[PDB]
């Protein structure tokens, strides 16, 4: 790397080289500044209202709470030791605070300990195929922790049974041999085994960035620089390029364009429309 001549010697693997024109490397302008852009949403995100819910939904009629217009701090969730598991599928659990999402759904319910494994993509079982089925391409994080002194006493948690044939993903069927009401209650008691203890499960279903996102992580925005090489990060769409004013007319629901190569071609500044 000392000089252009020394580059030619290294490529040619010789201390002397024949006359000619020799390709050696690739010149690249380096980015000078770093730009981070995110929206005003700095209102905090009510994850406490989910994970600290005094009452959780039964598994057959699981409670689907929407999360939007907030700044989600996932480090609080990820680091807390109160969780017996934290299993993400589409993303790495430490990267959550860097991304920004179109919307978030917190599907919360209580299931028996033995079936905690059934809350997973491409699984089947009594709970997974009659109560709460996840799609195979599920994107999100599954969280569970013991509730043996928040739920057990108790027979108020129901789960379906013999008569049915369907579970198609995220369907909530709350409809109520000789006869049998298609629901039987768990016998959650404080004196039973771990496999028989009740488990409070919260599943954060993420919808990947396809629209102007609304739930961003706790990132600090900066100013915007035009006509210069910068490393840019818009709502988690990272890359390197020269940001210029455009003459494109985005539709009000389109966050970003693309090229034929699936590379980003144009973006909408989340703070300046």
């Amino acid at each position: 790397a000392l000089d252009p001549l020394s580059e030619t010697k290294c490529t040619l693997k010789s201390f002397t080289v024949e006359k000619g024109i020799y390709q050696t490397s690739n010149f690249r302008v380096q980015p000078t500044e770093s730009i981070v852009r995110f929206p005003n949403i700095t209102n905090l995100c009510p994850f406490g209202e989910v994970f600290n819910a005094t009452r959780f939904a039964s598994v057959y009629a699981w409670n689907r709470k929407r999360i939007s217009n907030c700044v989600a701090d996932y480090s609080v969730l990820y680091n807390s030791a109160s969780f017996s598991t934290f299993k993400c599928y589409g993303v790495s659990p430490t990267k959550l605070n860097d991304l920004c999402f179109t919307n978030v759904y917190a599907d919360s319910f209580v299931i028996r300990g033995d079936e905690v494994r059934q809350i997973a993509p491409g699984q089947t079982g009594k709970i997974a195929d009659y109560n709460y089925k996840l799609p195979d391409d599920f994107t999100g994080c599954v969280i569970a922790w013991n509730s043996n002194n928040l739920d057990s006493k108790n027979y108020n948690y129901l789960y379906r049974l013999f008569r049915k044939s369907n579970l198609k993903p995220f369907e909530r069927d709350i409809s109520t041999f000789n006869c049998y009401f298609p629901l039987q209650s768990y016998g959650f008691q404080p004196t039973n085994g771990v496999g028989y203890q009740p488990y409070r499960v919260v599943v954060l279903s993420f919808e990947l960035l396809h629209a102007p996102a609304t739930v961003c992580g706790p990132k600090k925005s900066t100013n915007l620089v035009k006509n210069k090489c910068v490393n840019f990060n818009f709502n988690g769409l990272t890359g390197t390029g020269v940001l210029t004013e455009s003459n494109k007319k985005f539709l009000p629901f389109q966050q970003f364009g693309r090229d034929i190569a699936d590379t980003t071609d144009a973006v909408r500044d989340p703070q300046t429309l």
Partner: nanobody, 118 residues
Framework: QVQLVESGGGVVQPGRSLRLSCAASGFTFSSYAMHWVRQAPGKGLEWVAVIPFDGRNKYYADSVTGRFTISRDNSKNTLYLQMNSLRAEDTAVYYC????????????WGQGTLVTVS
């Protein structure tokens, strides 16, 4: 020491129902598998039913399958047997028994109660 007390015995008309109770003292009832055994007058004892300590399993004799129901509540340290559709041949003295290990141990047998179906 270890004493098991049966209760609820009496006289039964054919076809009706009765509930027995066995009380435990002097051992970790909440951690022992528990059994019922009956012995009709001057005849051999018959194994009836067994419940593990957590109640995840319940096994019954063929002569009482579908009619008898055993249950336990470790909080009260008691054993419960439900009889339905009682027939005359179910008349016997019923014993609640257990094991410090796995086999019915002599310290772990009650005095029994008499059940008469007629």
């Amino acid at each position: 020491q270890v004493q098991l007390v049966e209760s609820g015995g009496g006289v039964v008309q054919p076809g009706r129902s009765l509930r027995l109770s066995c009380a435990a003292s002097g051992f970790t009832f909440s951690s022992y598998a528990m059994h019922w055994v009956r012995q009709a007058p001057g005849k051999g004892l018959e194994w009836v039913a067994v419940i593990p300590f957590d109640g995840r399993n319940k096994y019954y004799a063929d002569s009482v399958t579908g009619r008898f129901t055993i249950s336990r509540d470790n909080s009260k340290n008691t054993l419960y047997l439900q009889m339905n559709s009682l027939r005359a041949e179910d008349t016997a003295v019923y014993y609640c028994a257990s094991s410090s290990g796995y086999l019915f141990h002599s310290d772990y047998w009650g005095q029994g109660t008499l059940v008469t179906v007629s």
